[PDB]
Amino acid sequence: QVQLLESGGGLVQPGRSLRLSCAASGFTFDDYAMHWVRQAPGKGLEWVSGVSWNSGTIGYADSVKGRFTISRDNAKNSLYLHMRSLRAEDTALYYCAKAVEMVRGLGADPEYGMDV
């Protein structure tokens, strides 16, 4: 069974850091690329960050470049998302998502298609 355990709840004031943790069950962590997508109320889904199957960070967003950071933990099947020096304008709901494509699906690396 594929269970997503999201940890790091609490209250944070602007000007400080934040840290969220993704845990996955029912599938192998390394085989799929892991992405973060956020969606404030009264607005659609919007990509905020991502990282490939090879634990390669893809970049930082246009609005929050220089402060967000993303990392994987292939040893313990976990994921870290750290928010450096947050501001009150960054308030929204964070979302953790997994890819689908099976490894070596032929002509680039399979890293897309969030489903769960």
Binding site: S52, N54, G56, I58, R104, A108, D109, E111
Partner: protein, 49 residues
């Protein structure tokens, strides 16, 4: 036969002289075919690190 008997006069008969033996002419090595491979081409052709 003369130097087998340690003599200069060989008397009528049959004398075992030496040994005949064929030698190996070439070398043959065999193994089952190779099927699997290590995932190095999956790393060096990857899109990113």
């Amino acid at each position: 036969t003369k130097c087998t008997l340690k003599s200069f006069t060989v008397e009528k008969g049959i004398y075992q002289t030496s040994n005949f033996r064929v030698q190996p002419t070439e070398s043959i090595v065999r193994f089952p075919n190779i099927t699997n491979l290590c995932p190095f081409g999956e790393v060096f052709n990857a899109t990113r690190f």
